[PDB]
Design an enzyme around this catalytic site. Structure first.
Site, PDB file in Angstrom:
ATOM      1  N   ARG B 227     -23.396  87.760   0.540  1.00  0.00           N
ATOM      2  CA  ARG B 227     -23.617  88.313  -0.775  1.00  0.00           C
ATOM      3  C   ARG B 227     -24.876  89.115  -0.570  1.00  0.00           C
ATOM      4  O   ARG B 227     -25.925  88.527  -0.248  1.00  0.00           O
ATOM      5  CB  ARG B 227     -23.863  87.224  -1.787  1.00  0.00           C
ATOM      6  CG  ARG B 227     -23.905  87.675  -3.251  1.00  0.00           C
ATOM      7  CD  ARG B 227     -25.141  88.382  -3.780  1.00  0.00           C
ATOM      8  NE  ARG B 227     -26.310  87.544  -3.571  1.00  0.00           N
ATOM      9  CZ  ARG B 227     -27.365  87.586  -4.380  1.00  0.00           C
ATOM     10  NH1 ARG B 227     -27.405  88.416  -5.429  1.00  0.00           N
ATOM     11  NH2 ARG B 227     -28.386  86.776  -4.149  1.00  0.00           N
ATOM     12  N   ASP B 229     -27.958  91.123  -1.986  1.00  0.00           N
ATOM     13  CA  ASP B 229     -28.864  91.323  -3.106  1.00  0.00           C
ATOM     14  C   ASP B 229     -29.350  92.762  -3.336  1.00  0.00           C
ATOM     15  O   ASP B 229     -29.600  93.496  -2.378  1.00  0.00           O
ATOM     16  CB  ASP B 229     -30.048  90.363  -2.881  1.00  0.00           C
ATOM     17  CG  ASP B 229     -31.248  90.578  -3.792  1.00  0.00           C
ATOM     18  OD1 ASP B 229     -31.210  90.100  -4.921  1.00  0.00           O
ATOM     19  OD2 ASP B 229     -32.208  91.242  -3.376  1.00  0.00           O
ATOM     20  N   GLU B 257     -24.649  92.316  -5.654  1.00  0.00           N
ATOM     21  CA  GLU B 257     -25.025  92.151  -7.046  1.00  0.00           C
ATOM     22  C   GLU B 257     -25.582  93.440  -7.640  1.00  0.00           C
ATOM     23  O   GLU B 257     -26.573  94.007  -7.141  1.00  0.00           O
ATOM     24  CB  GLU B 257     -26.070  91.028  -7.205  1.00  0.00           C
ATOM     25  CG  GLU B 257     -26.354  90.854  -8.681  1.00  0.00           C
ATOM     26  CD  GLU B 257     -27.143  89.667  -9.171  1.00  0.00           C
ATOM     27  OE1 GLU B 257     -27.369  89.622 -10.381  1.00  0.00           O
ATOM     28  OE2 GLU B 257     -27.510  88.785  -8.397  1.00  0.00           O
ATOM     29  N   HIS B 327     -27.487  82.377 -11.351  1.00  0.00           N
ATOM     30  CA  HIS B 327     -28.945  82.263 -11.415  1.00  0.00           C
ATOM     31  C   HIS B 327     -29.671  83.358 -12.189  1.00  0.00           C
ATOM     32  O   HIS B 327     -30.887  83.310 -12.309  1.00  0.00           O
ATOM     33  CB  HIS B 327     -29.476  82.215 -10.007  1.00  0.00           C
ATOM     34  CG  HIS B 327     -29.063  83.434  -9.194  1.00  0.00           C
ATOM     35  ND1 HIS B 327     -27.852  83.724  -8.720  1.00  0.00           N
ATOM     36  CD2 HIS B 327     -29.910  84.460  -8.870  1.00  0.00           C
ATOM     37  CE1 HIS B 327     -27.938  84.894  -8.127  1.00  0.00           C
ATOM     38  NE2 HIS B 327     -29.180  85.324  -8.223  1.00  0.00           N
ATOM     39  N   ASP B 328     -28.961  84.385 -12.659  1.00  0.00           N
ATOM     40  CA  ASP B 328     -29.590  85.458 -13.383  1.00  0.00           C
ATOM     41  C   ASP B 328     -29.250  85.423 -14.846  1.00  0.00           C
ATOM     42  O   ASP B 328     -29.565  86.377 -15.556  1.00  0.00           O
ATOM     43  CB  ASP B 328     -29.157  86.797 -12.778  1.00  0.00           C
ATOM     44  CG  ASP B 328     -29.854  87.110 -11.467  1.00  0.00           C
ATOM     45  OD1 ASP B 328     -29.258  87.743 -10.613  1.00  0.00           O
ATOM     46  OD2 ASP B 328     -31.009  86.715 -11.290  1.00  0.00           O
TER      47      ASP B 328
END
Ligand SMILES: [Ca+2]
Ligand SMILES: [Ca+2]
Ligand SMILES: [Ca+2]
Ligand SMILES: [Ca+2]
Lengths: 686, 686
Positions: B227, B229, B257, B327-328
């Protein structure tokens, strides 16, 4: 020429068809009217001639009645000379007003007009950009009794004035002599007579080439389409060879009638639409539309499920002819029925996929039960009814908006009484909303569409209480209340940049025939057409422009192919599948096999070495064969279209579920005839 | 191997990902716990280390917590060595517990474990058929102040222990020193610093080569996905050459993301998923599901719109990673909120298209607001919550039912609180019905489905008040009541006889690398894979079986291709489009053009003679180029992935919408580097 010209005889989805019973529309020439007992000028006895003719249709094209409605195709009664007898059934006198009781397929019915009047009809329709579809009923001639040769005209068949034969003393076997059908079985309905009509025998070579010669004459006179009657009641193998005759000669849009009752879904019907070479009058559409908009026996979810389900079940859904009533049904409008029902159902049909057909007189709100009451003379040529106005506003959109003509159908909002759906082709979209509840407004919230931002005016101008749609960012519409009975149509058109294929016609032909591919975004410069992976370019592309390309089918093996277009820049279109390349010209051979004993659920099939016989694949084998009327079990038989003038190899097999039993021995071999028919009679080889 | 194998690293649609903040899950080894000011064993200060590590994740795979839930993939914090500082931030001490402040991308963070604890995790995970995804954050290193070299570790970067450089006195320009982003533009958020994190300069060849070698050693340790970032904050041209490094070496599923707010739809977001070589966390899905199932700020028609709209906006919707929180975001379950909302939303995500990710502790109904509050330590390892049972019942369906893993999505019944949708792939079907109103039953009349007639138990066994479905003729279901808060799932599977392609991974690579095509009906014998019209067969198909074929990309021109599979008998599949074949290995080159003055929204673009540059098509030119931060207008600049080690011919052009103004002169030429970066600085030619 563009996809929309009247010269496009192959595909009709840009057209709106007006179905005329010639006798009941307008008597433009009184001198051709039948006399005596055959005629009723007041048209109160609806089984007699009232006097309508081809001059009357010419008059209503010329004075703008038909063209003011936006009609672009006329579908008229069978043009062929009919019997002259007045048949008294149970006291009621009956005539051939309807054109279904043929005696000479090469001459006109003089009540409708002369061959010069037929040519004049073709020429003024075409001069007014109207296409002409004729009925053609090759299943039978006319009422006959072999026991009583004096009844009617004994079903006699003439060939341009020359008598070929009658039903009594039929030594040539031009006709079937198996009795009348009880409709219990498809085989039973094919080889036995419908009611009393003398059934033609298509396995007789004289009948086979006569019928095929007769259809080429009408194609030579310039007709643009064919509606063939009683498709469920002729051998499917003979009809595919009849379709190959017209497609390899002068391909024109052809469709058949296979009646489907209210909740009937038939696999055979779908198979016929998908493999015969002709499309079908969409009875599945018409019966569900009447359940939702007329009789209220299903709601919008049924309509949705029919739209969604039929886009997959019909391999070429854009070729199906849709309608809400015709001469086989009670007219949609009833005496106690709100006229808004008919106006909404016509707006639904005009904006839906397929080829819409309006039955004459719908725009004048005619009501009537079944035959002959659904065939009254139309009462007025008023150009100011609301129904005339909704057709006038919507029918030109099939020529101007490719999403209405070819686009996919997507439901955007629904509840029991409201459907709003979107039609989309590339960048072109149409959105239509309909509230069938005549009492309750519907609150629409959360509608999203493919429309660009703007204030779309209802194409129907509020006449069915539609409203403007305000579309913001991302196709989201501002919320509105849809009026009781409300129907609105909103649209947007632009150029397509990508090739998109919307329709192809014909869908079955041999190498060398020119096919018509219609769509958008093909570009001006000549590109490439792929049949499978075979590319055809250059001179084989006889015509190329943005909405239409005409291309010769390459010399590839028989079988079914996907078609794809690549524009001159190399950008390719969607796949248009299920095209059948034939091995060559076709003839229909009757296959007969004796001593083919079977278990319950086990049937005999035929396969062989050519695509027409399925190329040795038991899942594509021909059949199940028949075994009751022409021959009886353990003899099985079947009429099969096969390539002409060739030695084919074949074998019979029995299938019970997944189990295939091939007959033993060497492969069978047979050299087919170049024209006419043939019979192979063999015995099961263990 | 089959598509559902733990060794399929390329496609994850058959998997359920469990997202773990390694420090907040399980402390399996207290000896690696940070000491003193960096650590809080009670984990009451959510900004300090609480002790969770890789050994603890091994213990929860081994004691049956994770495997009982049905999870098949785990996504963990960046494994890389982070800065050791405890950073103060206004009297609030902060540590790198989250893994986002990298120091050395070639070493492990020792609080999480050693290289040997990491290999152990990979191997325990793979033994228990769990795939391992790691975060990778190549945009930056850690909090740094060039003015104050004593702050934190001054963003220093090491290469396996050897110091490459720090943010203060960055003589070799390893970092960006343009100041911080105000997020005004894409360009501003790319080249300026995010918050106080030292922004790495990917135009520096040492940084570029380092990061690509660093990713390759984690791929060599066996990771199955990445993933990445802050995908919106690094150059697209550099990220595409990074993706090509992964895909041309050892292709694994990688997604980034790019945050989207409520009702935010970004066309650059969609372009990135469609063109970068990686897919994306589906924020579009997540935000709309929270509006409908949590916050009640939209209803089922908005969910329908998101579902239909994103199926066409994502070129590969089956590669997007869906979720309802992470988590965001604030945690979905609200403190003293209705648990049924969380269980419903979980069931919705689990049966929808894409790759579902569950944030750790969702099954324990963890609540919490924004960072650090959405990352408390998991409070329980209870296996009997309804949420644990919902995941347990539904996650295996993605392995067993291909309609769940790859099918199309179709709304079959809707009102503002109830949606029932169908997933379909061949003849496998799943239909799930959700009533989000917790107080009102719903009477479902008119549900038509693709399920065979029969009765269907709810696969959730009634735990969310579901019921049995009785399907009669034509998939029409009997009327039933959906309870308040009712969720039911019904399915039908059968084997597919014709090939259907459900997913392809990777979607961008040079000739010679092996891609994985997943689906059903491929058959056991090798057939053919077409990349366009180029048939690939025999030894180039590395492996073939019914659910998965592996094949080498043929030596075709760089460009985008359609893929189709034909099984051994010649039945061809659907087309899986948008596959990009690269001209070869990739390098990022910075192109700079000076004195390119433009008009009102006229911009400068780049094109040239390789597919990576649009092959001279101005509609496919690279740009609009940038002109604010690194160079200022009328100098324009862009970082573009191009084939490494070859001469390119290129030219700049300006586009005034549809007007292209090209540079005069002959084509420019450049021989690209074999590795690392290069900069072409040129002046506009009239
Ligand atoms: Ca007359
Ligand atoms: Ca017949
Ligand atoms: Ca620890
Ligand atoms: Ca950056």
């Amino acid at each position: 020429a563009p996809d929309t010209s009247v010269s496009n005889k192959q595909n009709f989805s840009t057209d709106v068809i007006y179905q005329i019973f010639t006798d009941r529309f307008s008597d433009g020439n009184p001198a051709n009217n039948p006399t005596g007992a055959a005629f009723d000028g007041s048209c109160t006895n609806l089984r007699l001639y009232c006097g309508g003719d081809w001059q009357g249709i010419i008059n209503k094209i010329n004075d703008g009645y038909l063209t003011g409605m936006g009609i672009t195709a006329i579908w008229i009664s069978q043009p062929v000379e009919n019997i002259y007898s007045v048949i008294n059934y149970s006291g009621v006198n009956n005539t051939a007003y309807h054109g279904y009781w043929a005696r000479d397929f090469k001459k006109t019915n003089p009540a409708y007009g002369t061959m010069q009047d037929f040519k004049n009809l073709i020429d003024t329709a075409h001069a007014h950009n109207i296409k002409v579809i004729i009925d053609f009923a090759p299943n039978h001639t006319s009422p006959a009794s072999s026991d009583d040769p004096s009844f009617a005209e004994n079903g006699r068949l003439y060939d341009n004035g020359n008598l070929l034969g009658g039903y009594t003393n039929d030594t040539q076997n031009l006709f079937h002599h198996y009795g009348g059908t009880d409709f219990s079985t498809i085989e039973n309905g094919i080889y036995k007579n419908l009611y009393d009509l003398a059934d033609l025998n298509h396995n007789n070579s004289s009948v086979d080439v006569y019928l095929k010669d007769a259809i080429k004459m009408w194609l030579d006179l310039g007709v643009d389409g064919i509606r063939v009657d009683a498709v469920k009641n002729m051998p499917f193998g003979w009809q595919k060879s009849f379709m190959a005759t017209i497609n390899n000669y002068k391909p024109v849009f052809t469709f058949g009638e296979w009646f489907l009752g209210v909740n009937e879904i038939s696999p055979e019907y779908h198979q016929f639409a998908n493999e015969s070479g002709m499309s079908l009058l969409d009875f599945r559409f018409a019966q569900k539309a009447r359940q939702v908009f007329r009789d209220n026996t299903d709601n919008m979810y049924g309509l949705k499920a029919m739209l969604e389900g039929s886009e997959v079940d019909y391999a070429q859904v854009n070729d199906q002819v849709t309608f809400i009533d015709n001469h086989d049904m009670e007219r949609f409008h009833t005496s106690n029925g709100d006229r808004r029902k008919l106006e909404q159902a016509l707006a639904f049909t005009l904006t839906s996929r397929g080829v819409p057909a309006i039955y004459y007189g719908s725009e004048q709100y005619m009501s009537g039960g079944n035959d002959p009451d659904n065939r009254a003379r139309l009462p007025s040529f008023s150009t100011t009814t609301t129904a005339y106005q909704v057709i006038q506003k919507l029918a030109p959109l099939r020529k101007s908006n490719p999403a209405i003509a070819y686009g996919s159908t997507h439901e955007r909002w629904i509840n029991n009484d409201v459907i709003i759906y979107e039609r989309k082709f590339g960048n072109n979209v149409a959105v239509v909303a309909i509230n069938r509840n005549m009492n309750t407004p519907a609150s629409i919230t959360g509608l999203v569409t493919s429309l660009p931002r703007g204030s779309y005016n209802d194409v129907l101008g509020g006449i069915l209480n539609g409203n403007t749609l305000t579309v913001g960012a991302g196709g989201a519409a501002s919320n509105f209340t849809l009026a009781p009975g409300g129907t609105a149509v909103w649209q947007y058109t632009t150029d397509a940049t990508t090739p998109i294929i919307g329709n192809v016609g014909p869908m079955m032909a041999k190498p060398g025939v020119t096919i018509t591919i219609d769509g958008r975004g093909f570009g001006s410069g000549k590109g490439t057409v792929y049949f499978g992976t075979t590319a055809v370019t250059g001179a084989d592309i006889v015509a190329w422009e943005d909405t239409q390309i005409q291309v010769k089918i390459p010399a590839v093996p028989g079988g079914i192919y996907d078609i794809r277009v690549a524009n001159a820049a190399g950008a390719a279109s969607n796949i248009y599948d299920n095209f059948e390349v034939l091995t060559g010209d076709q003839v229909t051979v009757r296959f007969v096999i004796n001593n083919a004993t079977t278990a319950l659920g086990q049937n005999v099939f035929l396969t062989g070495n050519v695509s027409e016989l399925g190329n040795w694949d038991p899942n594509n084998a021909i059949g199940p064969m028949y075994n009751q009327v022409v021959y009886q079990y353990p003899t099985w038989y079947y009429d099969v279209s096969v390539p002409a003038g060739q030695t084919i190899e074949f074998k019979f097999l029995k299938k019970q579920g997944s189990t295939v039993t091939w007959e033993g021995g060497a492969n069978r071999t047979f050299t087919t005839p170049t024209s006419g028919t043939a019979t192979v009679n063999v015995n099961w080889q263990p």
